[PDB]
Structure formats: structure tokens, C-alpha cells
A paper describes a structure:
[name] is a ubiquitous protein that is present in nearly all known organisms from archaea to humans. In its active site, [name] has two cysteine residues in a conserved amino acid motif Trp-Cys-Gly-Pro-Cys, which is a defining characteristic of thioredoxins. Importantly, the lower pKa value of the N-terminal cysteine of [name] promotes its existence as a thiolate, the reactive deprotonated form of thiol, and this thiolate can act as a nucleophile to combine with a protein substrate, resulting in a covalently linked mixed disulfide ([name]–S–S–protein).
Here we present the first structure of a BsTrxA C32S homodimer at 1.5 Å resolution. The C32S BsTrxA homodimer has the expected [name] fold, with a central hydrophobic core with a four-stranded β sheet surrounded by five α helices on the external surface. Importantly, C32S TrxA does indeed crystallize as a dimer held together by a disulfide bond between the two active sites attacking Cys29 residues. In addition, dimerization is facilitated by intermolecular hydrogen bonds and hydrophobic interactions. Intermolecular hydrogen bonds occur between the backbone amide nitrogen of Ile72 and the carbonyl of Trp28, and between the backbone carbonyl of Ile72 and the amide nitrogen of Gly30. The large hydrophobic residue Trp28, which precedes the catalytic Cys29, interacts with a shallow hydrophobic pocket on the other chain consisting of the side chains of Ala26, Trp28, Val57, Ala64, Val69, and Ile72. The crystal structure shows that the side chain of the mutated residue C32S points away from the intermolecular disulfide Cys29-Cys29 bond, forming hydrogen bonds to the backbone amide of Ala26 and the carbonyls of Ala26 or Cys29. The C32S BsTrxA homodimer structure described here, however, has the same peptide chain orientation as the NF-κB peptide. In the BsTrxA homodimer structure described here, only two of these loops are involved in the interactions; the third loop (residues 88–91) does not interact with the other chain of the dimer. Taken together, our present structural analysis of the C32S BsTrxA dimer indicates that the high-resolution structure obtained in this study can serve to visualize a mixed disulfide intermediate state in the thiol–disulfide exchange reaction catalyzed by the native enzyme.
Numbering used by the authors:
A (entry chain A): 2 to 111
B (entry chain B): 2 to 105
The structure:
């Protein structure tokens, strides 16, 4: 379940755990190309990664609060802190690489 | 030899001969990808093709007048009539083909 955020909800939605946030807009015909990517990533990683989308056409205030100057821009957040920035289109493999830098490599069994 | 249009000059700049017009904005990263393509097109066929760019963030009137609803959008015009519309990114070869349908 990819979440649709609003200016009002963005903070809460992104504040906890590992989160990939997608700043996009219908007007940037392009930035839509990310949407199927997010679906594949949600299929593969959804247990460990919360995906949040925010349509910056409808939600005009969030971009400025995160220094988003062009769309699309994706962010990786851990516990509400931005830990990666990805400007422009990137394929599933590139975004998987970024997120994985912030997830456990090992799971120790005691 | 690409022309940067404004809302005021757009209709006049695209009114004659074969024209490729690019609707883009710095705010849209995919729209910027069109630029090197246009430079290559100009190098290849600049004597037969006029290329006009319009930054819709600084010139928002023109997008409405041409029914542009997302960016980028490219138009081919012949003597001021829109004869092809291309929504989204397309590579040089695809745009070259669109224009070539309107030469001669």
C-alpha cells in the first residue's frame, strides 16, 4: 500500500521507519513514469519500506519544506531524517540500491 | 539557431514554414532532457527546420492557448497550423521522423 500524502499528512506519513517519498505531478507528464517503478518496489520491499507519494500540483507547500526544486525528486527517510536524495527518473534497480543502504544486510539468529 | 520564445512572441515565431516547438520547464526534469536533442536536430536540419522553445514556468499563457496539459509536449507546425503533437519524452530519431513527414 503506497500512501497518497497531502501537505497536512506528509510529516506524519514520513516520520517513522524507512520511507521512500515521491514528489511528482500530473503536469510533469514524465514524473508519472516513477509510478510503476514504485509498484514493483512495493511488491519486492513492502514489508520493510513505506512508499509515500505527494502530488505537488495539489499539495503546493511540501516541496519547499524539503528543498525540492524540480520533479520528480525521491527521498529516502529514516525515522524522519532525509538520508538519500534522488533527482530525476531512476529505474527500480537504482532505487532498490538507495533504499538498501538503509536496511539491514544481516539478520542474526542467536 | 533555436529560438527562445515568450508568451508575446510565440505565435509569431511559429507562424511560418516548418517549426518544431518545445514546451518545457526547469521545474520538470524530464522536460530538460529534450534540450540536447534539439541541439542535435538543429545541427542536422537547421536550414529546413525552425526550433522554438518555450519555458512554460515563465510563460504560462501559451500552454493554455495550445492545449498543452503536461510537459514536455512538442508540436510540429506547418505555416502556423499544428500538424503533429508529441506528448512526453521522444528520442531524436522519433522527432526527426515527425518533422520529415512535413518537409517538401
Amino acid at each position: 500500500a503506497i500512501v497518497k500524502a497531502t501537505d497536512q499528512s506528509f510529516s506524519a506519513e514520513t516520520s517513522e521507519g524507512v520511507v521512500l517519498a515521491d514528489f511528482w505531478a500530473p503536469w510533469c507528464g514524465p514524473s508519472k513514469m516513477i509510478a510503476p517503478v514504485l509498484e514493483e518496489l512495493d511488491q519486492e520491499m513492502g514489508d520493510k519500506l513505506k512508499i509515500v507519494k505527494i502530488d505537488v500540483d495539489e499539495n503546493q507547500e511540501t516541496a519547499g519544506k524539503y528543498g525540492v526544486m524540480s520533479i520528480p525528486t525521491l527521498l529516502v527517510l529514516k525515522d524522519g531524517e532525509v538520508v538519500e536524495t534522488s533527482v530525476g527518473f531512476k529505474p527500480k534497480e537504482a532505487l532498490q540500491e538507495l533504499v538498501n543502504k538503509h536496511l539491514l544486510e544481516h539478520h542474526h539468529h542467536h
